[PDB]
């Protein structure tokens, strides 16, 4: 019943919280990444203050500030959320917000994934068709079936190799 209380805080791998550069020498990152910094300065500032052996009053205030901090990272909003100082008053998407898809993410979840051999178009009726067939743009098929096609191109004299066969098509 002590493992409920945290003393070693694990930290999400960096890639799923990236720090990518976008346009005009400006970057984009996660709230998680800014939720951790504010935590550390406080644990780190505690190590100073405790080392210093400062008065208890202040040794406290920093721990209050450290509970407040770990809270807002694990589950930010269960005590009146913190925000990206200026910018706007948007609360920071915390590991909790993230898992349960708190902000229209669980509604986005059920909008499913995306699939890599797919396509879409308008439908025109096909009377001449038989029950188990459909009229499909060859145009469409040759995207969709591309890799399957490249081989037959290699099997036939249409290409020397696949890179040339793919090249034949771009």
């Amino acid at each position: 019943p002590e493992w409920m209380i945290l003393e070693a805080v694990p930290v999400l791998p960096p890639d799923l919280r990236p720090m990518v550069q976008v346009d005009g020498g400006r970057f984009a990152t996660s709230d998680l990444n800014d939720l951790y910094r504010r935590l550390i300065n406080r644990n780190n500032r505690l190590k100073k203050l405790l080392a210093q052996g400062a008065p208890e009053i202040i040794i406290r205030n920093e721990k209050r500030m450290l509970q407040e901090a770990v809270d807002a990272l694990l589950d930010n909003g269960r005590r009146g959320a913190p925000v990206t100082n200026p910018g706007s008053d948007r609360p920071l998407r915390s590991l909790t917000d993230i898992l349960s898809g708190k902000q229209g993410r669980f509604r986005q979840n059920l909008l499913g994934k995306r699939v890599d051999y797919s396509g879409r178009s308008v439908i025109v009726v096909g009377p001449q068709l038989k029950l188990h067939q459909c009229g499909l743009p060859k145009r469409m098929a040759l995207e969709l079936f591309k890799p399957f096609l490249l081989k037959k191109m290699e099997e036939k004299g249409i290409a020397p190799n696949v890179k040339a066969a793919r090249r034949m098509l771009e």
Binding site: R64, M65, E68, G80
Partner: peptide
Amino acid sequence: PKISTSDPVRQYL
């Protein structure tokens, strides 16, 4: 049990 939460400021002061 909700009378006040954002005490950290007031509490210290």
